Design a protein around this ligand. Structure first.
Ligand code: FAD
Ligand code: FAD
Ligand code: I55
Ligand code: I55
Ligand code: I55
Lengths: 469, 481
């Protein structure tokens, strides 16, 4: 077995294959640099209820994803125990918090933040999950600017965070302990694996978990595996002024174009703050000025003014694998022995133990986890929303980038922008395809891409229609 | 991974048959004894009731118009469902279908405020749906020989609205379940075991433990009491009470029976008169309805006399000298908020199919297909999402609507007897009933109002049972507000 990719997904499936099949040789590819790597840039939140949006829970496909995230949560305590068991005290703790506080402030669009807070509250009630709406004065540690302060707060019990760096170290250690072999090179081509040093590695099973590069690698063998783009994410490590940190995750609901504000606790007087999100049609390995300023401005005003005078340790950049139809690519292929584990966008890390168990069950002739069949990697592009829903959503999210800044402008201007944004986005959607509509996150990226890149997408969408219809 | 269906009524067996047929990979085990204690299904005629079940009150609420629509959808599944159940048997097992058509009769042995309004609502709902029917001369209704003072003056022929022999249906479902690889284990579930928010399986009343990744509760009136023992769920699954129903099998004086179902519209506290044809010189007559806070396995004298008096006067005087074969008693699962409990739970693998009151049997093919679709990652049937088993109590009617309804239905118990009393007395009772029912509704909860059928049961229950309901309603408010 060859696993292509050394993120959380690759290493998680690697650990589970090595542990449950001691007969077979499992080799895992990928370099220590982890170029464009989502996992090392992640806090990371074990996001289930925190990830709930009104928009997600209005589509069948969105309610399934949520259900899987709830299932994944139950696996984490034993998964961590089994990964820490292969190490010692000095390797550090994977878990950094047990609980999450969701904050509602007015530094955003009412159409996102008010709707999403209500949807989180609802989803917690439906699932009988332990939680309570608490007084904002009872949230520990936070010291917001009064004009940016929360007026409502939601304590979610058993929704926590891991140190993504200690998790990766623990996965590598646990992989080696179970007989896995780490070969620090990149796959160049799947033969039905040729590595970038010129060598060839034979195998009867290849699992592609190469993050945002996963589809580009399998497509060479193009219109049957949905494209994966780079959801470029910026986060930061900060040494706090006094070495303190909050006891819980602190977060807002998901915001304009799947951005969001959160602070994940870390050991040793550090905190993680994140995270920006921009779908890019080509990969990008560096934060923009705008991304850095926006992340820092939100954290200092909405969470703790003490972060203003705190020391910047590191600006982190990773690529969320962003699937063109908005849903993951998990499981089997029309090619025997070819598996794919990618397109997890915001929550691959959270779902990793469940997704790893699913793919291993499939590889052993099982059915794995029930709800994951819809997310077969070899599929027609899913249409989880009407064109109408997506056009309302993309205009709302565009307006939200203003309210999240937050801007100050004449009161006539937001009404002007609302009406003048509708036409151009409606025109783009109609021009792109008669059948497929890109989700909002990707549609804004396409709107502000070159004409050549738009035309290439029109060809792609047309070639996919001919293949499947 | 193993499926356990808890309950051997029409709902349990129907979902059992559909799981076994569409998932040949998995082992499906169905629990429940041949005694079918408190069983609604074996006490049912049963009518495939869609238009016959229409009341003015039902078609005035959003929730009521949805239920009606589902009943119309369920009707279309029955011909192929019967074909597929009879296919697993032979000639000598007998026919599931006993009639194709229903005649709705309007007589004056009831309240004008129910029977006149409900006859008009049935006529309207048939017209709206473009359903085949006609208002016919009463002299053209075959077989009936009513007492002239109890006779109908209007009659409504509904085409393709018929009846099944509930006993032959149950035998055919059991046979069809075994044919599709189901296993029947004739014991009762005592306890559902769950840990870390997932079903492990079922402890049975013989002491054994059966493991499963899917448990479907279709235990009729016992369904909520079984799931409520799990953490938090006591105030998250709406209570189901016993709609105790009395019916009878009669061997007719001459071996004859009507070619159609004969029925009135639904009457005081969802209590109705009907005759369902049977093979071999027998007829089914039903059916009484009384919500009881504890289960009851035996007919009262009052229920027996009322059922027999209505049938002999309003349908056929020949039934008076006809032989009583059997008095039947079953519990219609009566949900506290008046709507079914169908679908998924906060516990993974735990499904519920119950609280169907008067029409679970009719809706069984549709409800079975819905739950199987949900179990296979589908969305099932559109309108049934509203009836999720894990919910705040639904408030489908204002307190005002329910207080008018409970007084009207109370008065209807008089006109349906039918009573003979001084003409001042009904006006006195109308005015003196309003205060006590208004007082009870206000005392019970600031937010929830029990539907009329349940409110009258609460009115005439013990003070301890009323206080327990005040606590229940309060605990449900704290859980969901
Ligand atoms: C800013 C940010 C914040 C995040 N926050 C969260 C969070 O709060 N909660 C959460 O659950 N998740 C979070 N995530 C991660 C999210 O869940 C991702 O979906 C997940 O990390 C994807 O993991 P992966 O293994 O698929 O990809 P990656 O983590 O990108 O790993 C793929 C690896 O493959 C390597 N690779 C590329 N090409 C090749 C090749 N040819 N051969 C071999 N290896 C190759 C890459 O270098 C990389 O190391 C965050 C990500 C970002 C960027
Ligand atoms: C008098 C009367 C007339 C009716 N007429 C009609 C009609 O004309 N048309 C119509 O559509 N419907 C009719 N119904 C029935 C109505 O449709 C019901 O809603 C329906 O039968 C309910 O079916 P069920 O399978 O949920 O419950 P039931 O038929 O009550 O079956 C539940 C079964 O589960 C068993 N059980 C209980 N506890 C356990 C346990 N722990 N483990 C295992 N098994 C257990 C019970 O003994 C019972 O056999 C009538 C009912 C009655 C009482
Ligand atoms: N251009 C220099 C300047 O503005 N000096 C400030 C000045 O002395 C007062 O501020 C105003 N506005 O007069 C003062 C009130 O606290 O804070 C100062 N600013 C600081 N001091 C902090 C420490 O060196 C450590 N960490 C930081 O980030 C520094 N920022
Ligand atoms: N949260 C996502 C978001 O705001 N997306 C923007 C969105 O698509 C349009 O702007 C609004 N406000 O709607 C659009 C107009 O050019 O610019 C987007 N922003 C960008 N694109 C840049 C490139 O990826 C590289 N460098 C950056 O710093 C990125 N910033
Ligand atoms: N207590 C004796 C009695 O009253 N006998 C009746 C009596 O001879 C006449 O009626 C009056 N009122 O004199 C007579 C007119 O038909 O009916 C008699 N009753 C009957 N015969 C029926 C058959 O046995 C079958 N099933 C019944 O229900 C029986 N009822």
């Amino acid at each position: 077995v060859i696993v292509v990719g050394n993120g959380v997904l690759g290493l998680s499936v690697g650990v589970e294959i090595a542990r449950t099949r001691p007969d077979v040789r499992v080799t895992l590819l990928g370099k220590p640099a982890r170029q464009y790597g989502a996992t090392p840039a992640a806090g990371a939140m074990l996001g289930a209820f925190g990830e709930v949006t009104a928009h997600a829970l209005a589509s069948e496909h969105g309610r399934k994803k949520h259900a899987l995230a709830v299932q994944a949560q139950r696996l984490w305590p034993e998964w961590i125990e089994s990964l820490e068991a292969t190490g010692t005290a000095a390797d550090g703790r994977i878990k950094t918090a047990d609980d999450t506080v969701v904050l509602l402030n007015t530094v955003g669009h009412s159409a996102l933040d008010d709707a999403n807070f209500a949807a989180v509250l609802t989803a917690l009630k439906e699932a009988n999950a332990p939680h309570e709406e608490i007084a904002v004065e009872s949230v520990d540690w936070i010291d917001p600017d009064p004009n940016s302060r929360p007026l409502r707060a939601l304590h979610i019990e058993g929704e926590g965070s891991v140190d993504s760096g200690i998790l990766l170290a623990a996965l590598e250690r646990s992989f080696l302990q179970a007989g896995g072999r780490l070969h620090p090179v990149d796959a160049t081509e799947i033969r039905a694996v040729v590595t970038d040093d010129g060598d060839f590695l034979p195998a009867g099973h290849v699992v592609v978990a190469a993050g945002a590069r996963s589809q580009r690698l399998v497509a060479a063998l193009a219109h049957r595996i949905p494209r994966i783009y780079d959801g470029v994410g910026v986060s930061a490590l900060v040494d706090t002024w006094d070495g303190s940190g909050p006891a819980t995750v602190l977060r807002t609901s998901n915001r304009a174009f799947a951005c969001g504000l959160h602070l994940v606790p870390r050991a040793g007087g550090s905190v993680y703050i994140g995270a920006t999100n921009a779908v890019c049609l080509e990969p990008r390995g560096a934060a923009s000025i705008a991304e850095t300023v926006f992340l820092f401005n939100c954290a200092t005003h909405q969470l703790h003014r003490g972060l203003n005078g705190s020391e910047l340790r590191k600006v982190q950049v990773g690529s969320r694998p962003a699937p063109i139809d908005g849903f993951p690519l998990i499981g089997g292929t029309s090619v025997e022995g070819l598996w794919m584990l990618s397109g997890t966008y915001r929550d691959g890390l959270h779902m990793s133990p469940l997704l790893a168990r699913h793919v291993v069950s499939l590889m052993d002739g099982g059915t794995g986890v029930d709800g994951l069949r819809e997310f077969r990697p070899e599929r027609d592009l899913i249409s989880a929303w009407s064109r109408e829903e997506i056009l309302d959503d993309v205009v709302r999210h565009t307006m939200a980038t203003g309210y999240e800044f937050p801007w100050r402008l004449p009161l006539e201007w937001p009404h002007m922008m609302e009406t003048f944004l509708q036409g151009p986005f409606a025109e783009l959607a109609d021009r792109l395809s008669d059948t497929y509509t890109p989700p909002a996150d990707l549609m804004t990226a396409i709107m502000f891409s070159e004409r050549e890149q738009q035309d290439e997408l029109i060809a792609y969408y047309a070639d996919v229609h001919r293949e499947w219809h």
